[PDB]
Write a protein that binds this ligand. Sequence first.
Ligand SMILES: [Ca+2]
Ligand SMILES: [Ca+2]
Ligand SMILES: [Ca+2]
Lengths: 124, 124
Amino acid sequence: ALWQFRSMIKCAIPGSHPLMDFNNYGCYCGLGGSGTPVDELDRCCETHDNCYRDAKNLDSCKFLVDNPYTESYSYSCSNTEITCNSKNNACEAFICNCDRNAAICFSKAPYNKEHKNLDTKKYC
Amino acid sequence: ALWQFRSMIKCAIPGSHPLMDFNNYGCYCGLGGSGTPVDELDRCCETHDNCYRDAKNLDSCKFLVDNPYTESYSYSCSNTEITCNSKNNACEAFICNCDRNAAICFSKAPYNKEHKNLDTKKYC
Ligand SMILES: [Ca+2]
Ligand SMILES: [Ca+2]
Ligand SMILES: [Ca+2]
């Protein structure tokens, strides 16, 4: 679920404030996305966007108002490492991993202040 | 989700082992149920059974393999009191409460060893 993602990032990047940091960054971190990611962190976001698009195509998973962000799963955060509970159902397991993958992704990528609030109508 | 229910009970009745305790008790604690509950604890179970039946009728909620036991929600257990996370979606919120209600229910009801493994084909 969205509230769990922010907390997974905080989990992964202790020194961060996701809302502020990754929202409206590059071409993909933020609602929608278009064009080609402007950097590596942005590509992390694009890849997550795509994860959620796949999720949506699981004929067996039918998310509330078709929004995967609405699905709550079970994960643990212990000293920088994220684990998705193995008891999550197949749909939850799937969203869990998209989130987990994005967080690690964000962790290892270089952040560019320049790319925050970009003029997407022009560079994406 | 089922694994969260057992742990909610343990939460509510520290001195217990749910699996053993409440599984195959009376007419309703256990898969199915028929007849009239044999006591108060059994009625707790019947009421939960009914909760899950209602759940199933939410045109907006479409559980994996139609089994509400498969839905994982977010709750907290702090010193005997159970809280369902307010950020659970409407479907999860619903299953959360059925579970929460059953647990309190089990807590305040008298347990009868007699009623464990009953001859349901005869008394239910
Ligand atoms: Ca996006
Ligand atoms: Ca039952
Ligand atoms: Ca869920």
